């Protein structure tokens, strides 16, 4: 059996980025999918630390919280900076990614029809700090932090892809971002994952919006 | 002092890292930012995400309260004994951050009409951290392992502000209650929490708590 197990609802959501990590890194993993009926039965839920998914297992290490998983994988597979200073910068990117993700998730599930124009109007000002980060790291030719990939790249990558779905062309205002996205998705294993039914046949979110 | 904390004159998302610094005998400087200052827009335009806190470690400049916590935990050895404990630590902090966000939305966006439901949901919101204590040496040490981590300071602050928001919310949780007492009594932290620069600082900016 693979050492890793992803326990989630059948969507990309907060598991998209860590799945891309694992795929690009050539790791193997079991997917455990949870239906509404099963969630509604309440036994799994009660057993989750914060009563939510994703749930992740690495051997007998059981983790909750999507960014915990990302950092845990970034730690063990060496995608967490080359040094302590880089690691901080990697954290600083991911906190920003999370911040925007929280807003995205709020729009998608609590206020899509009403808030979408305001959201898209505000999108440029929200993406710009990431464009700025690229420009300050080797002309944005390599990765979000340093010259080696990190978990934040995989998280940022997902974030930009879902926003291109939400707001087609949004990256037209951000040359570095746009290319970044093309480049990281050209990575052979990731590209193969992204084109696969495993990724493509899952809806981004669970309410049918995007 | 090698550290600089740039922020608004409230505890808020700087309370945990202040406690961390004081408890670890670290020295730091406070650049307090006023409305006016914030209003000229030079600072803000300068901030990666247009927000505070901003932090300095020698020549390193950071943003994001949780990046600063992690940076301090990492460089001062407050991040678990190993990768496995370091994961546990993140799992506590991310959870602390989820409740805090809820706390923050209640306080600034929905205090009058959301407080009853907030406080009724509270115990189920605090049970995970009591359970976490329950699984680690019967809760007589720390939130993870037997050495303090950045998550302790962050969870400590979370529990203190809730005790102000809903006095006695810890009364049904004996490990949480003893833990708050234990950590709050650590000499350097104890002195800091009794000091004016803590006590005379408003928790939040809009006068609600
Ligand atoms: N800080 C944590 C947070 C993790 C987290 O949010 N988990 C949620 C995800 S469900 C997710 C969610 C919602 C609505 C729906 C609605 C329809 C739906 C159909 C098919 C699949 C999903 C999957 C997820 C999901 C939803 C669906 C929405 O309303 C929710 O807010 C969430 O965004 C959950 O487990 N909910 C179960 C419950 O609390 O009892 C982390 O980063 O890991
Ligand atoms: N993910 C980040 C989040 C950091 C963050 O939220 N920063 C905010 C803090 S201001 C804080 C805040 C708000 C309202 C007020 C209202 C009155 C007020 C009076 C005196 C002091 C403060 C201090 C903070 C503050 C406020 C006050 C509220 O509306 C805000 O949401 C915040 O909770 C900020 O810099 N605002 C400047 C602006 O963006 O332009 C992190 O973890 O560090």
Curated annotation (Swiss-Prot), chain B:
CDD domains: GST_C_Pi, GST_N_Pi
Primary location: cytoplasm
Residue(s) carrying Phosphotyrosine: 3, 198
Residues found modified as N6-acetyllysine: 127
Reactions catalysed: RX + glutathione = an S-substituted glutathione + a halide anion + H(+); prostaglandin J2 + glutathione = prostaglandin J2-S-(R)-glutathione; prostaglandin J2 + glutathione = prostaglandin J2-S-(S)-glutathione; prostaglandin A2 + glutathione = prostaglandin A2-S-(S)-glutathione
Keyword Lipid metabolism: yes
Presence of the UniProt keyword Phosphoprotein in the record: yes
Modification N6-succinyllysine occurs at: 102, 115
Annotated positions binding glutathione: 7, 13, 38, 44, 51-52, 64-65
Localization per record: Cytoplasm; Mitochondrion; Nucleus
One of the GO biological process terms: xenobiotic metabolic process
Top-level taxon of the source organism: Eukaryota
Effect ascribed to mutating residue 98 to A: Reduces affinity for glutathione. Slightly reduced catalytic activity
UniProt-listed Enzyme Commission number(s): 2.5.1.18
This protein's name: Glutathione S-transferase P
Gene it is expressed from: GSTP1
């Amino acid at each position: 059996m693979p050492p890793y197990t992803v326990v989630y609802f059948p969507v990309r959501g907060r598991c998209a980025a860590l799945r891309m990590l694992l795929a690009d890194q050539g790791q193997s993993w079991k997917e455990e999918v949870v239906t509404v009926e099963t969630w509604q039965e309440g036994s799994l839920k009660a057993s989750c630390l914060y009563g939510q998914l994703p749930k992740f297992q690495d051997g007998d290490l059981t983790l909750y919280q999507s960014n915990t998983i990302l950092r845990h994988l970034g730690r063990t597979l060496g995608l967490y900076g080359k040094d302590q200073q880089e690691a901080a910068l990697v954290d600083m990117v991911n906190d920003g990614v999370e911040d925007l993700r929280c807003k995205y998730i709020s729009l998608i599930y609590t206020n899509y029809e009403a808030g979408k124009d305001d959201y898209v109007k505000a999108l440029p000002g929200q993406l710009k700090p990431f464009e700025t980060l690229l420009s300050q790291n080797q002309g944005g030719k390599t990765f979000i932090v340093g010259d080696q990939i990190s978990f934040a790249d995989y998280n940022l990558l997902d974030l930009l892809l879902i926003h291109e779905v939400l707001a087609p062309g949004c990256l037209d205002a951000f040359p570095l971002l746009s290319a970044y996205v093309g480049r990281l998705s050209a990575r052979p294993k990731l590209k193969a994952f992204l084109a696969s039914p495993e990724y493509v046949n899952l809806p981004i979110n669970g309410n049918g919006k995007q």
